[PDB]
Amino acid sequence: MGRGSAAQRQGALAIMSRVYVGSIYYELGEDTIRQAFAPFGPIKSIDMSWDSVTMKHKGFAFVEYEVPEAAQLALEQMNSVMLGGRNIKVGRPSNIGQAQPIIDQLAEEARAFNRIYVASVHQDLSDDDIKSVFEAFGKIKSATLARDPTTGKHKGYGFIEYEKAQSSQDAVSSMNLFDLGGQYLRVGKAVTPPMPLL
C-alpha cells in the first residue's frame, strides 16, 4: 500500500520530463530551441506552436527530455536567457490534471537516495572516468552513463549515487557548470528515485 500505480507514476514522469518554453522570437525555430536546451540532456522531441493563417509558430513550445532531471535543470538554468533578442520563459506544463500528488510523491521518494544527475558528458569520458572525478567528493555506490540500446555509446548523461548525502550535496555545488572536455557539465540532485516504476 504505497502510492501511485505504475501507470500513474509513468504519466507523472512523462509530464515531469517536459518544460514549457515561451516568448520565442518569431524568426527562431525548432533547431535553435534544440541547441539551447540540449545541454541539459538529449531532446526527445519538441512540440512547437503553429498558426496556419500566419504561417509561423505562436511563440511557445514544449521541449521533452528523456528524464525528469533534465527538465528540472533546464527549468533552473534556462529561464530568462536571451534568445533572438527576447528573454525566453521556461516553466512546468500547466496541465497536470491530478498528476501533482504523484509528482510530489516521486520527489519525496527521491530524497531517500543520494543520487545526482549529470548532463553534457563528453563522448570520450567513460563510466570509470566520471566515477574517478566525482569520487573526489565522497564514496560512490554507482556511477552509470545512459547508453544507446543499439550502439552501446553513452548518451551524454548519467546518474551517480553516493553513500553519503553530504557527498552528493558537495558534488552538485562544485560540479554544476564544471568545464570538462570542452563542455560545461550540468549537474543537479535527482527528482525521482532510481527505479520509479518498480
Q: Which three cell numbers stand for residue 160?
A: 551517480
Choice from 153, 174, 181, 197 touching a copy of itself (CB under 8 A):
174
Cell 496556419 locates to 52
User: Residue 97, Cβ neighbours under 10 Å: how many?
Assistant: 8
Say whether residue 131 binds a copy of itself (CB under 8 A): no
Distance (Å, rounded) from C-alpha 116 to C-alpha 100? 22
Q: Are 163 and 138 in contact (CB under 8 A)?
A: yes
Taking CB under 8 A as the criterion, the residue among 49, 66, 83, 89 binding a copy of itself is 89
Interface with a copy of itself includes 107 (CB under 8 A)? Answer: no
How far is the C-alpha of 5 from the C-alpha of 9, rounded, in Å?
A: 6
Which range in 54-62, 104-112, 156-164, 166-174 contacts a copy of itself by CB under 8 A? 166-174
If the CB atoms of residues 156 and 162 are measured against a copy of itself, the closer one turns out to be: 162
What are the φ and ψ backbone dihedral angles of 81, each rounded to 5 degrees?
-70, 145
CB nearer to a copy of itself: give 10 or 100: 100
Stretch of 59-67, 129-137, 165-173, 179-187 contacting a copy of itself, by CB under 8 A: 165-173
Instruction: Please select the residue that binds a copy of itself; options are 172, 180, 193, 194, rule is CB under 8 A.
Output: 172
Neighbours of 196 (CB within 10 A): 18
Whether residue 163 contacts residue 140, with contact meaning beta carbons closer than 8 Å, is answered with yes
Residues engaged in binding a copy of itself (CB under 8 A) = 20, 22, 75-76, 79-80, 86-87, 89-92, 94, 169-170, 172-174
